[PDB]
């Protein structure tokens, strides 16, 4: 499973 995104807080 993907790492958590880091684009919008």
């Amino acid at each position, epitope marked *: *499973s*993907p*790492s958590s*995104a*880091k*684009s*919008r*807080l």
Partner: antibody
Amino acid sequence: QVQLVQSGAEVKKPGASVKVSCTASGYTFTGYYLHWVRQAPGQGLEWMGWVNPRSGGTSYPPKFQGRVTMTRDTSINTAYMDLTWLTSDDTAVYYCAVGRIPDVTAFDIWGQGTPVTVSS
Amino acid sequence: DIQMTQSPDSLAVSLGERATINCKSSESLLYDSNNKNYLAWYQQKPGQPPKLLIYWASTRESGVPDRFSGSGSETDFTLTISSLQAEDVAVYHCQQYFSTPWTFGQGTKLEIKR
């Protein structure tokens, strides 16, 4: 008018530190993570970590854990990346970058770049 | 963790003709629970920052002309310029965002063949 405006070029000696700023405009600075990505000659883009402009929290990959300090200053919409123990491998163009797309950690806003030369 | 390898390193294509750039991931960017490929493409013209070109493998970022196309799945991807224009000369990078640290490929330089 969305843009990230970085500071001017830097020349440094091995062992010294370097600190580059990034000034945001045209969007909500406290709405998105602020990342730093460098590009060494013949190397390929390399992510250094991010800073949370709201909380002031950071996260760095192992390679840069212990050398990098990322900080913000929301009064002036400005982020800072600070790198210590510089060597020749730290010679690169340093970019700040923002991603605005939900669940997509890819960057659609970039600073013009800050070249950093490290030499004795 | 995830390495990204692009091929070729350098590419020359005639004006009007078709350009193809591949990217190999070391692990697989497809999540079986949403059927999405976690892969982005960038265009970098000389002396300027990267510009986001394609994300989710095949979705074009807003403003990207139709001639740019992304395809592929899992570990094997491809960026295609169908009718090469002059302003398309640049270095193209593929970036995975499945896992952190977010990692890029080494870049592929695209130049006009004459």
